[PDB]
Amino acid sequence: GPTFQDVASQVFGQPVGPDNDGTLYIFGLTAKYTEPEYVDGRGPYKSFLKMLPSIRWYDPEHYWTNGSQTEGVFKNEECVLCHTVQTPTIVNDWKQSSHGSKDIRRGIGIKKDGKPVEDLVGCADCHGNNHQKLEMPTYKLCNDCHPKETAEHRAGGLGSHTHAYTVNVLEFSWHVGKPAEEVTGCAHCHAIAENRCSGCHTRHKFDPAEARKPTACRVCHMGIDHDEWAMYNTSIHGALYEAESARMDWGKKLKKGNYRVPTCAYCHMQNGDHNPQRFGTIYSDMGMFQVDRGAPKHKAKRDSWIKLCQDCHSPRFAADKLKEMDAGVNLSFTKWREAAAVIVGCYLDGVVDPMPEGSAPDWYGHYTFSLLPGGDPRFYATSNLERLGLEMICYLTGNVYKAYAHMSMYNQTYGNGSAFEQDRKLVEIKTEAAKLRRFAAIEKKIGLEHKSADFWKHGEYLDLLPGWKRKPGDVDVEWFKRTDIPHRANADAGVEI
Amino acid sequence: GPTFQDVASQVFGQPVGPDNDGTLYIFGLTAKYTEPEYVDGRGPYKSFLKMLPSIRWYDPEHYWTNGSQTEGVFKNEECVLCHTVQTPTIVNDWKQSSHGSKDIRRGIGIKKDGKPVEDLVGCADCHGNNHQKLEMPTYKLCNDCHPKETAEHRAGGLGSHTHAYTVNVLEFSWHVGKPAEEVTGCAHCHAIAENRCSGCHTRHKFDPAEARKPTACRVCHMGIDHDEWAMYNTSIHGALYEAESARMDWGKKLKKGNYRVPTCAYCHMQNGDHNPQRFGTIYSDMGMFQVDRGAPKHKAKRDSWIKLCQDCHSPRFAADKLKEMDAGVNLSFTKWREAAAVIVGCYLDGVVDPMPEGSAPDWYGHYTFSLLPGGDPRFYATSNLERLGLEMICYLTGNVYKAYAHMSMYNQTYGNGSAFEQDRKLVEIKTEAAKLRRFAAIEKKIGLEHKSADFWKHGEYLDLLPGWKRKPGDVDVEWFKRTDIPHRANADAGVEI
Amino acid sequence: GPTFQDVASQVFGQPVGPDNDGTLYIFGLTAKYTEPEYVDGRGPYKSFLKMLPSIRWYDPEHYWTNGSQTEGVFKNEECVLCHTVQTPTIVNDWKQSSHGSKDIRRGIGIKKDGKPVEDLVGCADCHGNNHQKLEMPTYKLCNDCHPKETAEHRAGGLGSHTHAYTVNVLEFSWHVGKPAEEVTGCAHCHAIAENRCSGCHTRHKFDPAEARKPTACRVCHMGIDHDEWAMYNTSIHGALYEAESARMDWGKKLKKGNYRVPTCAYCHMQNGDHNPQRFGTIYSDMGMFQVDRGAPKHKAKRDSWIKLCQDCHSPRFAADKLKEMDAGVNLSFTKWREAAAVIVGCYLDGVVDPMPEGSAPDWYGHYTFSLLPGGDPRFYATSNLERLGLEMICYLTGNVYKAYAHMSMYNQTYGNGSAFEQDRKLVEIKTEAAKLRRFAAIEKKIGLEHKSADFWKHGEYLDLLPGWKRKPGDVDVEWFKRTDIPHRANADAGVEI
């Protein structure tokens, strides 16, 4: 029989066709989805995880191959001469870097294989000399000459740059649960943080002064999932950054007394430490887990933060501000616990629409409520009630912590990720629960047997989800057995983590 | 009987009165709406379209009249002497422009009527010498001395600056469908782009260095309708713009090798081309129409973009990034097609509340479903289901394209106009559909004849809409017959377009 | 029986415990809320209002106490020597201020007790000489040497910096209605504006050039409650600020002809006036009250604004722009009045779910509809219908005024706080009303007696609200009797205001 596309075609007078043939499809109505070319993904879900081939740039050790049309073995100077014409800005950047200009070097004492690096570090030194065997580097290259910074970059725990891709892309439910082309940006954002040294001081200038600015962090550290850029920007610190950025001296090292206005790097890469996670009190899954950072057991961490603030403030003032965070965070969890009780209550009474068996299976292949143990908390392919629940804990409750940590008066109270947004979300959740309960009570009284709509279970997008494909023995548990990396507590991990 | 205002008056003790009399109305409850003074609008709907008189500044050829109290015929120097006192910044701007200062001229070779312009171009040269017959210019004036830039500015197709007002204000459903004072900003934003030469390099400095900055575009190129500023700003390019803006040389022409960080103008006004639309692969109604820009038939356009990126990147890298766009866009349309099926399904089963006959007529004067052929897709004066549908296609699906085109990792996936926002909107749409279906099933079983509420059809705002006033013969179809401008495919156009 | 925490504990294997003991609680599920240490709040609700002890910094006259561990009586030079080590940036700021550096003084003629201040104004001059009796100042200190600026800062009416905390924190429903730690940022934002002189030109540099920038206002003047920063930033003025900030001369006094680009301070602190409220036509509760500022009775104010704009524009142009504001504002109230009729209609027909007696009492201790006289308009602890109503009047209708006042073409029409957001909110409100009415009609026909869910009335957060604690005689009406400050028209004020 006719598909949606077939019917649309008959009404609009545009033939059905493949999405990728170049036709301009009116409202995309008569286009058929085609699977892009994929490569196999890595990690514990390698049996079905895919990536677009462009993963070559971000996990080059496992995916990089020669794809150049230019042949020859060249000297550094020859790289520069041709690329001056062919990719001019790369050469301009490099000429303005310490690698390509001795005049701006600071005599740091850089060594390779125990010997001082006194020459230019040219294109060929990083990419190789043979244009048919060019190399696309990771931090492994930089380690040859910058071992201190690399060791620190590799010193973080789960939730740090160190494992952002290897663990928190390849094991993450929201990534593995979706078609590869939908989440390319997830792989790359997290992979840039882990595998590269250019997330903060970009190629090819590699300028530490650039890395000190909030712009070195905010492309990644933003949004409803983790809104720390907005929290910082809407603090007095952030306003002063905007006011002073144009005329302040960004060439000064991150040190006590060198800056009036603190930035992300100042507070988190203290004294140039390339393991920024380590200053945090404790990893809390972005504030979705509740912890009082002002409790006696965390005194050393709290005192360390107070001393950091004391670069520019009374320590009594700083202590008071961090206590406001503790108090505000603890109040915020009362609203989440209210939400959770309402939501789980609906599931236990069997009034959620759809119920889990009425939806597509989750990415484990289970028909399991998303906000119970063993489920997959999410915002997609689930009930409205479960969506709103996820929004409450992740987008709002987590960000209340971020608002307090960064001194955003407005976002603690009124704004995005605030107390008052929590209030409004709680009203939304209760509203959904109330509607569900009223429908169920009416249907019971009149003897109407409600069946959840088929659109909760099947559709052009829902039919693409990996939950449909899951089968016994499709998990690489040897990956989860690894002890050289941490792991996520996934329901199908199959082993101790 | 008493109106809302009358009842409110009796409860609050504030008399009913006209909104425009200067009274401070408590929550605006007892104020009566008054129609502002209008002038007639232009275009195919001129029989009922209105504008506020302030349209004089933006379509001066058709609306400008003398409104000055100052009399005299003056020389350029006299304009300057008096306006130094009367409008100081205009004079300061002009004195800092090439028009008013020979010292900053570049010897471009500007001519008027075949003769070199060697004098100052003063207030009177652009506005006239008689203060009771002052002129308010458009690009027609600038063409006298800058024919190349003007020709390019006038070379675009539908969806470009060239027809932004003449076609895409005067023929646009959302503009013609609303009271004039509600949409003044629409007329002016679109009219500034079309009729003026000051949208990017503002009067009275007319500084190209200003026009090269993203600030020259983002006042217009923003928001949930078309969020390209945010997409750019949340890319690494955008972060580098913020980092480098204060110290970079904006005086350099937009040319390969002159910039490290690309801006809107760099990529879209390539080499100073004043027809920025022409570099686009194809006009797609802001990404609401699906097209694979990586398909064989679009190879020339794709290769041109790759070469643009190659100013600062490997062309293989650029090609991969643009393929990610193609793939991400194609996946995004699966969710829209799901949404559309759910929404139209509800209409075909007769369970939408209100149904079209329960709402105010659309701007054509029809009681027609908004998301069917011949309807008016919209976010106002319609059902919640239809609102959510419009939000899905315009605000979200269109912006997924914008997120990929501009390399915003976060907004492709998590953020505003992203895949995950599409997911959440799809849950909202299914939720509305499910509620509608459950109500209809209950009402059928118990024999309750539901009538949609009167507030869907009538109210103080809804009663102002032009749909109520539409009648046969009220369209100027001669306008649509014009072949010197393109046209929108409006349901009542009455002729071939 | 088991609480939510007890049940969660049994399912997750984490013991129940107090939120403040430092345990990392999985999704905060097994943590019990503990009341933070409070101090008593001031104002008419002092019988139950609380503050966190950190209020010491913001209302120091009533809460400041010695909390230093350092003992001694010191000379100014000694303060500097030690704090160079102990709080370096404070000293660096002070050394770069006129107080601490004669070289940057302008010979203003500053006097204390009728005598010229010719020495440095050091740490001890502002904080005292005894480290166990240090002072935390307000504007009262600054008045000793800057009486003109202080008098103006203290000259505003309700809705100005002058009474931001004393009246609009201590008397405000949303503040007094919530646990103290939830609204700390409210107290501090409003208290910084009232009690300090560092909101715009921050300590310890106290630089007027900093205060002239929009960054001096936007930390407070932002968001869905009052979005003037975004309105300004998305105007051409705001784009030009961003374009010119890095290279423009911010050292010039706010005067006609000194600036190309107007900022908040330029337009509102005209010629350096420290009572910025006074230039407004009339206080309108942030545009929630409707007034036509172009009406004959407001001509003097309108003419004054036109003349301000004429620093850089034709006064005819300016007049037209302010008339667009008047017209756009008046149209916006038609949609609010529609919303209000729908919402109140539902209450009068008894179909709101919950009805007021089904919710927790409001902060007065009443079970009263929030959008009727005597009620408490709010977004929390109320029905979805009432939430949406508050969002319509405060977040949207109020901000339409802000969008027009600040020349944001996009936000007048499409964007945040716009006409089209009003449209969408109106659809949401009608949708809620329609659902409520359909449920009520079904339940009546089948004889089902609906009881609103218990979660509308009780829960871990709702149980903390002050409405439960209210009792006769708990209002300090002597506060409301004061005539030296204005007051809010609270339902339980008990006296004439």
Ligand code: HEC
């Ligand atoms: C040895 C062969 C090197 C390799 C491999 C990499 N870099 Fe390097 N780096 C090298 C030298 C000789 C210098 C100059 C030292 C001096 O005396 O000044 C640098 C400098 C840097 C810097 C600081 C730049 C600045 O302007 O202050 C950075 C941030 C940097 N290098 C980064 C970096 C990265 C990310 C690398 C891997 C891709 C990398 N370097 C490789 C020598 C060598």
Ligand code: HEC
């Ligand atoms: C000092 C004044 C800071 C600046 C500037 C920025 N942040 Fe921050 N951050 C700061 C504190 C005191 C905390 C709480 C840590 C604690 O244990 O008490 C945080 C928190 C974060 C986090 C979460 C870290 C964690 O949970 O362990 C992140 C990811 C973070 N901050 C990032 C971040 C960014 C991107 C910033 C610039 C935009 C930024 N911070 C500014 C202190 C300070």
Ligand code: HEC
């Ligand atoms: C952001 C999180 C960064 C990442 C990821 C990496 N670097 Fe970095 N780097 C960053 C900052 C903010 C600074 C300045 C710090 C300061 O003390 O002011 C730097 C500096 C460097 C340097 C210069 C060191 C010196 O002696 O002057 C080098 C050589 C360097 N960074 C290298 C480097 C490498 C090899 C990285 C990957 C492993 C790397 N950086 C990542 C910010 C960030």
Ligand code: HEC
């Ligand atoms: C008057 C002109 C002052 C001089 C001189 C100094 N300070 Fe100050 N300080 C002043 C005020 C009005 C305030 C209150 C906060 C506000 O913004 O109004 C403060 C605050 C402090 C604080 C606490 C706040 C903090 O950021 O930690 C400290 C620790 C402080 N001041 C110390 C200090 C020192 C060491 C000074 C000399 C170098 C100094 N202040 C000068 C006003 C004035």
Ligand code: HEC
């Ligand atoms: C002839 C009578 C002119 C008319 C009419 C307009 N302009 Fe012009 N323009 C004119 C001259 C003689 C020059 C200087 C040329 C030189 O040799 O440098 C210019 C310059 C400009 C520029 C570039 C300014 C810069 O600083 O680089 C711009 C952007 C410009 N003019 C814009 C412009 C517009 C928008 C006009 C219509 C309103 C317009 N010009 C009229 C001469 C004449």
Ligand code: HEC
């Ligand atoms: C180069 C690095 C770019 C910069 C900087 C900006 N944009 Fe862009 N844009 C770019 C590409 C490769 C595309 C896709 C075009 C294609 O056919 O593949 C776009 C798209 C747009 C569009 C839509 C154009 C169309 O559909 O034909 C608009 C309106 C647009 N971009 C505007 C825009 C603005 C305002 C920017 C600065 C904020 C901006 N772009 C940056 C490339 C680049």
Ligand code: HEC
């Ligand atoms: C934004 C979309 C623009 C509009 C609309 C107009 N101009 Fe423009 N102009 C713009 C930029 C980004 C630049 C610099 C381009 C570059 O190559 O770097 C310019 C430049 C000019 C110039 C100077 C040309 C020269 O030879 O140096 C002129 C004379 C000029 N622009 C005129 C002009 C006119 C007449 C316009 C209306 C028809 C117009 N511009 C619109 C950006 C934009």
Ligand code: HEC
């Ligand atoms: C080591 C210090 C490097 C030197 C010297 C040069 N490049 Fe490089 N480049 C380097 C890294 C680590 C990467 C991977 C991306 C990242 O940010 O980590 C790259 C990338 C490239 C690319 C592809 C990416 C792109 O933007 O197109 C190209 C085409 C490239 N590099 C070329 C290049 C040339 C011509 C150089 C000499 C002028 C050069 N690189 C220097 C590290 C280093």
Ligand code: HEC
């Ligand atoms: C007298 C003992 C003072 C007290 C108390 C405060 N300030 Fe002051 N201030 C004082 C002097 C002698 C000067 C320099 C005057 C001159 O001739 O230039 C100032 C200056 C300022 C300024 C302007 C600074 C500038 O760089 O232009 C500001 C904004 C200022 N002072 C603010 C200020 C505040 C907020 C105070 C209370 C906390 C305060 N001053 C106290 C003398 C005295």
Ligand code: HEC
């Ligand atoms: C001049 C060009 C202005 C700039 C720059 C900013 N604002 Fe403004 N504001 C301006 C006008 C003409 C009005 C309307 C006043 C009237 O009576 O017609 C306003 C309004 C406000 C308000 C409300 C004031 C009131 O209701 O009385 C506020 C709080 C406000 N503006 C603040 C503000 C801020 C924070 C700005 C920078 C971000 C800003 N304004 C810019 C004129 C101008």
Ligand code: HEC
């Ligand atoms: C923002 C709303 C401000 C607040 C609150 C206070 N001040 Fe201010 N101040 C502000 C600006 C924008 C300026 C520059 C104004 C101009 O004309 O350009 C100033 C300036 C001062 C000065 C210098 C006066 C002089 O003669 O040069 C002083 C002494 C000053 N301000 C003091 C002061 C005091 C005592 C305040 C609290 C009562 C105060 N300011 C608050 C902005 C703002």
Ligand code: HEC
């Ligand atoms: C041509 C190159 C011009 C010269 C020389 C001057 N102005 Fe102008 N002005 C010009 C245009 C094309 C416009 C229309 C608006 C637009 O952006 O296209 C204007 C506008 C004005 C206005 C009204 C708008 C306003 O901001 O109030 C006035 C009052 C005005 N111009 C005055 C003026 C004076 C006094 C001049 C000499 C110093 C002057 N203009 C020069 C184009 C040109």
